[PDB]
Amino acid sequence: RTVARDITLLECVGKGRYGEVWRGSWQGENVAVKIFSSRDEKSWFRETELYNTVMLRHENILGFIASDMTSRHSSTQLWLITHYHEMGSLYDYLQLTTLDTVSCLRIVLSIASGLAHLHIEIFGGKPAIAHRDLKSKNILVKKNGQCCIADLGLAVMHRVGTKRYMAPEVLDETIQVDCFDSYKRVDIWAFGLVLWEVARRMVSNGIVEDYKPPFYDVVPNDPSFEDMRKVVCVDQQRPNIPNRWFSDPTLTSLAKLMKECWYQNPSARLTALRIKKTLTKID
Numbered sequence: 001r002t003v004a005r006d007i008t009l010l011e012c013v014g015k016g017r018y019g020e021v022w023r024g025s026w027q028g029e030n031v032a033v034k035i036f037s038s039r040d041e042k043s044w045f046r047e048t049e050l051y052n053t054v055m056l057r058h059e060n061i062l063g064f065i066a067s068d069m070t071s072r073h074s075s076t077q078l079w080l081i082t083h084y085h086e087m088g089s090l091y092d093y094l095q096l097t098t099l100d101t102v103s104c105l106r107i108v109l110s111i112a113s114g115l116a117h118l119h120i121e122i123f124g125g126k127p128a129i130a131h132r133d134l135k136s137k138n139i140l141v142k143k144n145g146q147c148c149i150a151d152l153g154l155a156v157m158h159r160v161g162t163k164r165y166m167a168p169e170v171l172d173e174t175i176q177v178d179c180f181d182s183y184k185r186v187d188i189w190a191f192g193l194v195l196w197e198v199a200r201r202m203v204s205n206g207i208v209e210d211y212k213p214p215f216y217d218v219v220p221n222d223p224s225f226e227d228m229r230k231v232v233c234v235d236q237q238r239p240n241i242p243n244r245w246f247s248d249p250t251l252t253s254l255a256k257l258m259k260e261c262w263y264q265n266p267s268a269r270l271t272a273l274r275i276k277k278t279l280t281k282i283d
């Protein structure tokens with residue numbers, strides 16, 4: 001039989017230290033192709049090892065298609081091929097868009113749903129998985145208004161995370177590294193930051209905040225590990241909740257939720273399943 005492997009690369013939709021992401025075509029359908037830098041080969045190996053262990057399938061997890069290694073004259077080429085989401089990243093989308101109550105809740109509940117799916121061990125099933133680099137650039141927006149979580153290159157089953165989103169126990173190096181629940185609690189911290197980024201863009205009473213990344217007001221661009229440790233660990237700062245949120249029942253509830261993802265004590269933080277339940281009871 002014919003195995004039509006050929007993917008056509010059409011347009012570059014992202015370039016970084018990781019490598020590049022392209023919109024490609026396979027058999028008349030868009031696919032996303034991540035081409036890894038030599039610098040980041042371990043991320044390809046880790047995501048490939050995870051998908052060889054468990055074929056995750058969930059509407060809020062970026063859909064796997066293929067992992068390809070191709071021998072070149074003097075190098076190895078590494079591609080990850082996934083579903084393509086033409087609306088792009090949540091980071092991209094929030095710059096560009098304000099939200100209403102329904103669209104804000106649908107975004108955050110879809111992220112919580114993908115995250116709880118990663119975190120839960122299913123017997124018969126899947127191992128429990130922590131993401132370890134959750135952020136708005138690692139979330140894609142789908143046409144149906146839900147999101148999906150991308151990039152399992154740092155994931156752990158039972159490179160460091162983006163410093164802006166690191167939990168206090170990562171920055172102060174107290175994290176219990178032999179305890180898998182520690183990694184779930186680091187993802188919950190990061191989720192709370194994402195929830196804050198999104199909520200800012202939800203309109204209430206004709207008011208909205210401009211898009212800003214977490215801690216925009218207290219650290220530089222490309223903040224150092226020390227910059228983040230001083231804010232998060234030493235001073236114990238948390239993102240600002242604007243007064244205008246307290247006139248809106250949805251934003252009032254989301255402010256409480258994000259506070260319960262940001263406790264200094266990792267074991268006090270809400271679980272992804274508890275976050276889901278709370279979000280289903282808002283509005």
Ligand SMILES: COc1cc(-c2cncc(-c3ccc(C4CCN(C)CC4)cc3)c2C)cc(OC)c1OC
Nearest residue numbers: 001002003004005006007026031065066067068081
């Ligand atoms: C090698 O590389 C790539 C291959 C493909 C691809 C193209 N046509 C057909 C296939 C196919 C799938 C599944 C079977 C099954 C059929 C049932 N039987 C009991 C076991 C075997 C056979 C063939 C594939 C996998 C796409 C790629 O990119 C999207 C590839 O490159 C990454």
Ligand SMILES: COc1cc(-c2cncc(-c3ccc(C4CCN(C)CC4)cc3)c2C)cc(OC)c1OC
Nearest residue numbers: 002003004026027029030031064065066081082083
């Ligand atoms: C990698 O990705 C894609 C692959 C394909 C594709 C191409 N040829 C053959 C297959 C296939 C056929 C049959 C079996 C099964 C069915 C019965 N079972 C009991 C055992 C064997 C598995 C696989 C597929 C899935 C299509 C895709 O899109 C339409 C793909 O996505 C881009």
Ligand SMILES: COc1cc(-c2cncc(-c3ccc(C4CCN(C)CC4)cc3)c2C)cc(OC)c1OC
Nearest residue numbers: 013021032033034080082084085088089138150151
């Ligand atoms: C985060 O991580 C990964 C993401 C993706 C991915 C999947 N669908 C779509 C995209 C995308 C498409 C289009 C735009 C822009 C371009 C045009 N316009 C200016 C606005 C929209 C942005 C982004 C991406 C980047 C794939 C990945 O792997 C294959 C990723 O790595 C795991």
